[PDB]
Amino acid sequence: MKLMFASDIHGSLPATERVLELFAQSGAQWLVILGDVLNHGPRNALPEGYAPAKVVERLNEVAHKVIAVRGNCDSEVDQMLLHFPITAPWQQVLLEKQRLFLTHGHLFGPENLPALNQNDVLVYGHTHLPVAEQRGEIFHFNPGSVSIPKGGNPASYGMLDNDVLSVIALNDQSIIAQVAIN
Template identity: 80%
Template sequence: MKLMFASDIHGSLPATEQVLAHFARSGAQWLVLLGDILNHGPRNALPEGYAPAEVAQRLNEQAARIIAVRGNCDSEVDQMLLTFPLSAPWQQVLLSGQRLFLTHGHLFSPDNLPPLAQNDVLVYGHTHLPVAQRQGDIFHFNPGSVSIPKGGFAASYGMLEEGMLRVMALNDHRVIAQVAINP
């Protein structure tokens, strides 16, 4: 299974357009959105090209291929604009012998882990910082932010392909971080 991950769009239309273009070319079966899709939130400056209604419209075109979780900046009003479900605080994707636990990162995080089995993967956003590493018995993966990157990192997204999780720079597709997750 090939998956593409994007987090913390925060209403940026240019970032959304880039994500959707990469998704179309990637061959991924699913686009996993890790929350904070439409609103910038009170702690963030407005991202470039802030246009939440247009972001919703563009994402709705791919609704049948989106798996999403609710972030701390997502609301019931946002769900009214989106045709794919956004109200769940977490989702799971089952791989052969492994589970991807998808969450935004404000409820479950590396500091507040859900119950995970050996070799499971905690997939989260929220911090806007890319992570791809094994910590103890589980893997941690954060694709960073496509619109408001932090820590001096480039805007980024994630890919899962052939047992490898990669964080990729949005503009030039260089690998920022990666980890093999095959048990």
């Protein structure tokens, strides 16, 4: 199975178009969006090519292939525009060998862990920092941000391919971090 992950888009049209381009070329079946989709975010500058209404038209074109959770920056007006369900604060995704716990990062995350099974995967964003590692009995995965990178990391996205979780550079496409989840 092949899944693509994207998070903290914050209204950036160019980041969105590049994501949708890589999605189409990857062959992945679904696109998981971890929150903070249109709103740039009160405490920071507008991202490159900020254009909420256009990001909306682009994303709504693959709405039937999107799985998503509510970011701290997402609001009711956002759901009214996006043709896929974003209001759930968290959502589990059942895979053959394990579970994926999807959440933005502000309500649940590394500091407030959910009950899970050994080798399950905690998937979150919000921090804008890439992560692909084993933490205790479970795995932690954060695809970083596709628009507002932090900690010196390049804009990035995530990918699940053949039991391997990888954080990939949006432009470079070089592997930032990865871990096998067998």
